[PDB]
Write an enzyme that holds these catalytic residues in place. Structure first.
Site, mmCIF file in Angstrom:
data_model
loop_
_atom_site.group_PDB
_atom_site.id
_atom_site.type_symbol
_atom_site.label_atom_id
_atom_site.label_comp_id
_atom_site.label_asym_id
_atom_site.label_seq_id
_atom_site.Cartn_x
_atom_site.Cartn_y
_atom_site.Cartn_z
ATOM 1 N N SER A 48 0.783 -1.187 0.000
ATOM 2 C CA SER A 48 0.000 0.000 0.000
ATOM 3 C C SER A 48 0.837 1.270 0.000
ATOM 4 C CB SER A 48 -0.887 0.115 1.224
ATOM 5 O OG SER A 48 -1.938 -0.844 1.238
ATOM 6 N N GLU A 146 -3.989 -6.907 -6.868
ATOM 7 C CA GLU A 146 -2.946 -7.740 -7.440
ATOM 8 C C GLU A 146 -1.530 -7.289 -7.079
ATOM 9 O OE1 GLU A 146 -5.640 -6.362 -9.169
ATOM 10 O OE2 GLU A 146 -6.598 -8.355 -9.709
#
Ligand SMILES: *C(=O)N1C[C@H](NOS(=O)(=O)O)CC[C@H]1C#N
Ligand SMILES: [Cl-]
Length: 268
Positions: A48, A146
């Site tokens: 992230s 993904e």
């Protein structure tokens, strides 16, 4: 005489022994120019953590598009993906680009990050923004979720701790962005909610910290980068990234915080 980098390195190696994987660290003191570096040029998955740089790329776009930030993006069901706690709440209304950006940075909202990626022309759009500020290492290839796969050997969706730190410094402290946009980036980082057990856990509570975390959820793969402002001193920019060889090796916030401490303490 230069620093004895073997001595600077030793406690990181020890940490990574008990961790069972690899820790990458780069820290730069913007006052003195001192650095701490450990596997700082190895690649690690972004997870992230690309979302901070995403918000910066959005801010760069806004410089040329007046009011882009206050423009609502109204989306359907297909925008949504797990770990999207803010964009899920506003499905029935939409969110402004600024709101999506804050959500991406401060809650690591996946759907919000994908919506902003679309605004920049996909992952390649963000990579191109990073190249524009002289980051040749950063690469975002895929979308949420993904990009979190973190498969051993995969160079997709990675950067180095050093490149992360140099790019973070350019965007938060240097003039890569215009001053309002730079301040907005800092403000978003400062308001992150997901980082209290990572770099922030190593910093005195009275020192301001802006950060962005990443947790791929496999292969011991997790990270944090930050700007730290010690009271009355030059800020520090640093990045701590981990990975491990087995899918079920646990990532560790304690290890990240311990490596941040070692890095911060080793600057002079
Ligand atoms: C990103 O790495 N994410 C988003 C979400 N938040 O975790 S984070 O460490 O705060 O960034 C869950 C884990 C992962 C996904 N998907
Ligand atoms: Cl849709």
């Amino acid at each position: 005489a230069t620093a004895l980098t073997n001595l600077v390195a030793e406690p990181f190696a020890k940490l990574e022994q008990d961790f069972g994987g690899s820790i990458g660290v780069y820290a730069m003191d913007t006052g003195s120019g001192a650095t701490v570096s450990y596997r700082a040029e190895e690649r690690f998955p972004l997870c992230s953590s690309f979302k901070g740089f995403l918000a910066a790329a959005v801010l760069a776009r806004s410089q040329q598009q007046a009011g882009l930030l206050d423009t609502p993006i109204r989306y359907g069901k297909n925008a949504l993906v797990p770990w999207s706690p803010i964009s899920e709440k506003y499905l029935t209304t939409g969110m402004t680009v600024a709101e999506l950006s804050a959500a991406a940075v401060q809650y690591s909202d996946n759907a919000a990050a994908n919506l902003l990626l679309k605004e920049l022309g996909g992952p390649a759009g963000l990579t191109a923004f990073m190249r524009s500020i002289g980051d040749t290492t950063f690469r975002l290839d895929r979308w949420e979720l993904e990009l979190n796969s973190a498969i051993p050997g995969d160079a997709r969706d990675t950067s180095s701790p050093r490149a992360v730190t140099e790019s973070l410094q350019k965007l938060t402290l240097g003039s890569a962005l215009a001053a309002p946009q730079r301040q907005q980036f800092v403000d978003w980082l400062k308001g992150n909610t997901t980082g209290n057990h990572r770099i922030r856990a190593a910093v005195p509570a009275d020192w301001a910290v802006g950060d962005k975390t990443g947790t791929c959820g496999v292969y011991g793969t997790a990270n944090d980068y930050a700007v730290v402002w010690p009271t009355g001193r030059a800020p520090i920019v640093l990045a701590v990234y981990t990975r491990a060889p087995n899918k079920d090796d646990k990532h560790s916030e304690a290890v990240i915080a311990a490596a941040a401490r070692l890095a911060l303490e080793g600057l002079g």
